Amino acid sequence: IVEGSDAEIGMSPWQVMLFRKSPQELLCGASLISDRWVLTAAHCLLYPPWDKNFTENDLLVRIGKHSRTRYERNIEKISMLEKIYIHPRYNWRENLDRDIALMKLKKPVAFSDYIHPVCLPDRETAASLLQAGYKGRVTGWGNLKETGQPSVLQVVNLPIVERPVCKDSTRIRITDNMFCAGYKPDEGKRGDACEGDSGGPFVMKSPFNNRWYQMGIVSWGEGCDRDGKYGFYTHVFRLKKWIQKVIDQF
């Protein structure tokens, strides 16, 4: 996260770190959506141009964390993957359309002050909140700058951007399964996701029922926090029918 701030303790208790076993490293962010299901970006797991293709056994999910590198004894919980499910039409060839994946945990994780699931939106909350200028929140342990690394979880709030402006910012073909967020150069303020934040959540707090909903997934961008560029997010509500199908089938 570039131009964000330290998170408060327990501020994002659905935050998940995807951790490579060997070598031991931060692979990506992710989200807890129940006691056995974790949501992330397909590209975190599968990206053939770069020979990326992780198997369950290659990684761990770490939940309840605040510090990036420390083993947070008595606070974090580490869980093994039973199975990965990637969207069958994830378009890694062209534009990362449908950049979404699910991971089922081998055992249920115990909820705690630091570990708690985020909600997924239904049509009405997406319609109500996914509006240009409405702000969401992105969190992660990614890089602090495009070209160091944070000691603890970072947080930044960013406004959703009008679809024409998203489109006009990039030569990539944008789809209805993506939205973009970030300030425009003339708005003064800054902030973006960056390398290591991939797969983590874009959340919004409903003013109707005071609950946090994950509206997006950190998916892609061009550099980080560049003027005239915006972060792109997977549109979670638009792929919810696939999420439901998977969870209901498995």
Partner: peptide
């Protein structure tokens, strides 16, 4: 720079 995690998880 990651701290070692319990061998049980590896």
């Amino acid at each position: 720079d990651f701290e070692e995690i319990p061998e049980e998880y590896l």
